[PDB]
Design a binder for this molecule. Sequence first.
Ligand SMILES: *[C@@H](O)[C@H](C[C@@H]1CCNC1=O)NC(=O)[C@H](CC(C)C)NC(=O)OCC(C)(C)Sc1cccc(Cl)c1
Ligand SMILES: [Cl-]
Lengths: 302, 300
Amino acid sequence: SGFRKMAFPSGKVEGCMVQVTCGTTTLNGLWLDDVVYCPRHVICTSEDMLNPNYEDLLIRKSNHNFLVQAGNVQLRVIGHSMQNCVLKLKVDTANPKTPKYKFVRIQPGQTFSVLACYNGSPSGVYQCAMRPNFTIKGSFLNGSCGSVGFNIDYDCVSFCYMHHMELPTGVHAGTDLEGNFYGPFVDRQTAQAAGTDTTITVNVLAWLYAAVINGDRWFLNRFTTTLNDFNLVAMKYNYEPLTQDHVDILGPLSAQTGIAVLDMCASLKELLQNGMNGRTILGSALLEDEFTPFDVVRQCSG
Amino acid sequence: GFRKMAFPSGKVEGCMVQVTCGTTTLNGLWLDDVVYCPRHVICTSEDMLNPNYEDLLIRKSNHNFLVQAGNVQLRVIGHSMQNCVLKLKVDTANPKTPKYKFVRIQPGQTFSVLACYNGSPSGVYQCAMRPNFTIKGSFLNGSCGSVGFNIDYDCVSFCYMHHMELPTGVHAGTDLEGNFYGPFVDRQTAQAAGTDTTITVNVLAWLYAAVINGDRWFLNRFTTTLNDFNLVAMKYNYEPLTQDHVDILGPLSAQTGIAVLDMCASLKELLQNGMNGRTILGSALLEDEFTPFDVVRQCS
Ligand SMILES: *[C@@H](O)[C@H](C[C@@H]1CCNC1=O)NC(=O)[C@H](CC(C)C)NC(=O)OCC(C)(C)Sc1cccc(Cl)c1
Ligand SMILES: [Cl-]
């Protein structure tokens, strides 16, 4: 309670969604300036999906085999190339709705909004976290590939995710906008599985900071720890080790509360070793790990 | 395979503007040549405790209202009040005005909120109208005039405009006719809501969602009558389940092959026993802000 998963407003991304069709296979693409980005498996027949030779499938393709549409309006394709697992289709029209944007590759633990799309039309938007096993717990059906995940910083859309697949456990995997998968997955219809997931320590710490900011601070103790000692203990509880970047992005919440990051780690260490003893934090007996330090700032101070 | 999903907010973002009167700034909704916003923008500090709004509005001029759409000021050429909403007529029509209507939602229904500050969209999330006519939102200073909405076909149904926070941290507001949901009043006083209840038909929709996604540890072989379930529900401050609700659940029942009253039997067992360590769709608590329509749209 107090916090909810808040997505970024989706309008700037909605203005960039199109559909891309090869034969009868339609998925979503992202139209920025005069380039459309989409998953390369749009060019696959199901026979060639068991294990595709993408370079060879693409040699047989011409610009005029790709049907790109913004709604019902066709955008003529004038060039094509493959970059890793994404297709780049040059089109003859620069998207007038192109926002200021960048392509970023996010780290596990970071959150982003997903604009779920089908045949080029948005259905919904929600907030996802990249798990340490490089999956997301999304909500995706057939025809959703090419949907993108993004953050907005002032004027600028940072695109971080394009959707490609669903795994047996029901979680989802995909690439950055340079076509590089997050995690060890491949865009082939061969059996693959997500590694064992772990808890996102940096986000749990952000949540404890958030609890302190709201006056819920019984779990603070008078001790500290080294980063190494904490990481070795955390791993025993299936918690991710902290990086230096994690310590850095906790900086603003550390300053707001006056609680050093390593002192908060010592408090978390005691919670892990001793449990809640029947208590709650921000209403919950469970520790939340899908709010980043930035998400906390957004909702408390923003 | 299940998330709290909001409608895409682009059609509403194209309507948000900033409205300023004196030292007060909040958001307005610009449709055609009219901007809608909470009337308490005209309020001063020395009047917020018992504001005679009709009296305060007659003392204002069109030029006291600064409306800005981005870096562009819109000229106000007229103004009226409809209940707790101020209507500012401006000289230019919003070309981004979508197909739309104003609706009043019922408790238990859900909608998306576009939280805005200074006329700029900041975040989007899904909310439910609580049975006590509050909403559990995330709203800060300056968020007033933010709107809640649903989308059907290409039509945006506006149902909520944000006015206030209660001491318990929940929120209250009006429909776009300016009528509050609940017994709340747009004066600067601490106000409390009636006792809340849990939206039972929605908890059931969410249990069906957890089945669809393979969670079924909570199912059982028992069955219950509708009335006997409702007796237990009311004891735990759950809303009673109507036969219209049973019908509304049919698709989810058919899709899973679990009779509605069988799912009621599972919910009764959870209410009486608890979850006992276990979680459903990741939660330790029963979720009641997904409607049947919500769950279906997302599992279809
Ligand atoms: C978009 O094309 C689509 C999106 C999924 C369809 C249903 N929900 C989705 O998120 N993507 C695909 O269908 C994938 C296309 C391939 C990767 C080129 N196919 C896919 O997701 O298959 C999953 C694997 C890789 C075969 S692992 C697996 C094995 C057995 C059972 C399951 Cl559920 C997954
Ligand atoms: Cl939430």
